[PDB]
Design an enzyme around this catalytic site. Structure first.
Site, PDB file in Angstrom:
ATOM      1  CB  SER A 203      -1.097  -0.050   1.070  1.00 46.66           C
ATOM      2  OG  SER A 203      -2.108   0.935   0.854  1.00 46.66           O
ATOM      3  CD  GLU A 327      -5.266  -4.300  -4.152  1.00 44.55           C
ATOM      4  OE1 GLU A 327      -5.304  -3.489  -3.211  1.00 44.55           O
ATOM      5  OE2 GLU A 327      -4.327  -5.131  -4.293  1.00 44.55           O
ATOM      6  CG  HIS A 440      -5.558  -2.973   0.409  1.00 48.24           C
ATOM      7  ND1 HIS A 440      -4.779  -2.693  -0.694  1.00 48.24           N
ATOM      8  CD2 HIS A 440      -5.067  -2.222   1.422  1.00 48.24           C
ATOM      9  CE1 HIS A 440      -3.840  -1.827  -0.355  1.00 48.24           C
ATOM     10  NE2 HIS A 440      -3.998  -1.519   0.922  1.00 48.24           N
TER      11      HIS A 440
END
Ligand SMILES: *[C@@H]1O[C@H](CO)[C@@H](O)[C@H](O)[C@H]1NC(C)=O
Length: 535
Positions: A203, A327, A440
């Protein structure tokens, strides 16, 4: 010393360290935790670049994780493992610039390739001390030297009055760079090879890696790069200088505050006050947007990431990039009405149109309607299951999947060696609801080999899969190629090219080669949508 374990005493540039013998599944590992790499960025040093740690006297105890950088603490689901696992697990302090090292035990004989981890958390949270970042397994099983550093997040890390001296921006990135400089000087003391240093992160960690790739002074500090579900380009990872000035002065206002005089006031405020107003400065109601992030300063970042990846020479760079299947799903429960962890989150068309405004907060009315037109399934425009999943895909595509696609494509066309994956396995231990699919952040526990720990309740195939993934990552770190030189029985992972656009799936089944990273949809985000703005 005299009675201690002779393998746990190491000297580095700042002095002597005592580390700890840690128990992993297949045997012991050496850990050195909480090594200071910088002077505490406290008091008059808040908002300032880090200065290197001044040498200490005596043996520094390096047996426990150090403080976490002052940060916003998530309270959306108080008590829930799915959220708590990302929360700080040591005391919050502005005195937090410390790093961690894991090595085999005893330390390796010949110089070993080094993996440096950079955590994510939107640039407002995170810590190198979380259970999911435990380096013990890669150290024990793959023989790797693993390093992770704390860097300053939120205001303390990224609040900027661009041009000023007292708050120049991007200092969180400079914390990261200083720890990279620390690895170059000191890692050989642990049996690490400073000539084989791979960055990897997820990330905002992935964006951080990409920024080191794009920032020349960082270039000589590492050799290879992994970016997991994040990129320095895209709508969230950076802000213009103008927008950073705007947010920094508004936050100042909110806490009761010539750049010098403003900053000096901000430095008198308690850390917690800054945290309490952090989220109040965003221009629109939004998800997957964060208040204080890297700034395009014309210094650390000489131009926009978009510009730097478009025009850069990536001759001798090897890069591994990828995404998880779902995601966007995670982000939806943090502010799109209709969505929750506690139900199926089936939504109406209205709630979908509202979510698109929140998820694409920078879209004009026309652009939003384009997004809506593209994602609607016109056979079933009102179906709640589809609309729920379309909302997830919108957020995921816009913020991660298409930024990655853009990045892989530009890097490949400009000489880089690129491997691309999509991670598709949902942990059997996952506590988020089934509708979130493979969310995610949830490949990390596999890359790090947590499933190897019998006490964690993963399946046997999950154990085997984790080992596969660990092989991939560490092979890539060693050579710039994830494949095994021997093992030609197992299927091969081709490089990503612009002609063939190949990438692999990561799941319980053997590698499958797929073509085109959401190619049609990404043309919408990366080629069309920008032009519905130049108008
Ligand atoms: C699921 O939960 C949220 C918040 O409690 C609610 O607004 C939403 O409508 C729920 N979905 C349904 C229709 O059960």
């Amino acid at each position: 010393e005299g009675r201690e374990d002779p393998q746990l005493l190491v000297r580095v540039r700042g002095g002597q360290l005592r580390g700890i013998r840690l128990k992993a599944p297949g045997g012991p590992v050496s850990a050195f935790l909480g090594i200071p790499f910088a002077e505490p960025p406290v008091g008059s040093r808040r908002f300032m670049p880090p200065e290197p740690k001044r040498p200490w006297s005596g043996v520094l105890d390096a047996t426990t994780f150090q403080n976490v950088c002052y940060q916003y603490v998530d309270t959306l689901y108080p008590g829930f493992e799915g959220t708590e696992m990302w929360n700080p697990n040591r005391e919050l302090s502005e005195d937090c610039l410390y790093l961690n090292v894991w090595t085999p035990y005893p330390r390796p004989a010949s110089p070993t390739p080094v993996l440096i981890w950079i955590y994510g958390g939107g640039f407002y949270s995170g810590a190198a001390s979380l259970d999911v970042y435990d380096g013990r397994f890669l150290a024990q099983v793959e023989g790797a030297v693993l390093v992770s550093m704390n860097y300053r997040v939120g205001t303390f890390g990224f609040l900027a009055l661009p041009g000023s001296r007292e708050a120049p921006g991007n200092v969180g990135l400079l914390d990261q760079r200083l720890a990279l400089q620390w690895v170059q000087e000191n890692i050989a003391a642990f049996g690490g090879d400073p000539m084989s240093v791979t960055l990897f992160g997820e990330s905002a960690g992935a964006a951080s890696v990409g920024m080191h790739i794009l920032s020349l002074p960082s270039r000589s500090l590492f050799h290879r790069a992994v970016l997991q579900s994040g990129t320095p380009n895209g709508p969230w990872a950076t802000v213009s200088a103008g927008e950073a000035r705007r947010r920094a002065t508004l936050l100042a206002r909110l806490v009761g505050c010539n750049d010098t005089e403003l900053i000096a006031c901000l430095r008198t405020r308690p850390a917690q006050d800054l945290v309490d107003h952090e989220w109040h400065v965003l221009p629109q109601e939004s998800i997957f947007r964060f208040s204080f992030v890297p700034v395009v300063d014309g210094d650390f970042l000489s131009d926009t990431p978009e510009a730097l990846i478009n025009t850069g020479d990536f001759q001798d760079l090897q890069v591994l990039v990828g995404v998880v299947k779902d995601e966007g799903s995670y982000f939806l429960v943090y502010g799109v009405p209709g969505f929750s962890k506690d139900n199926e989150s089936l939504i109406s068309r209205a709630q979908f149109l509202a979510g698109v405004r929140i998820g694409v907060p920078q879209a004009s009315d026309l652009a939003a309607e384009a997004v809506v037109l593209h994602y609607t399934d016109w056979l079933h425009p009102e179906d709640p299951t589809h609309l729920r999943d379309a909302m997830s895909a919108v957020v995921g595509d816009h913020n991660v999947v298409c930024p990655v696609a853009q990045l892989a494509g530009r890097l490949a066309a400009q000489g880089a060696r690129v491997y691309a994956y999509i991670f598709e396995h949902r942990a059997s231990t996952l506590t988020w609801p089934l509708w979130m699919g493979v969310p995610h952040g949830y490949e990390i526990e596999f890359i790090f080999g947590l499933p190897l720990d019998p006490s964690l309740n993963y399946t046997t195939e999950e154990r085997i899969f984790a080992q596969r993934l660990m092989k991939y990552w560490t092979n890539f770190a060693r050579t710039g190629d994830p494949n095994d030189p021997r093992d030609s029985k197992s299927p091969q992972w081709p490089p990503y090219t612009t002609a063939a656009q190949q990438y692999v799936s990561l799941n319980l089944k053997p590698l499958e080669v797929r073509r085109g990273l959401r190619a049609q949809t990404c043309a919408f985000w990366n080629r069309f949508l920008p032009k519905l703005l130049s108008a």
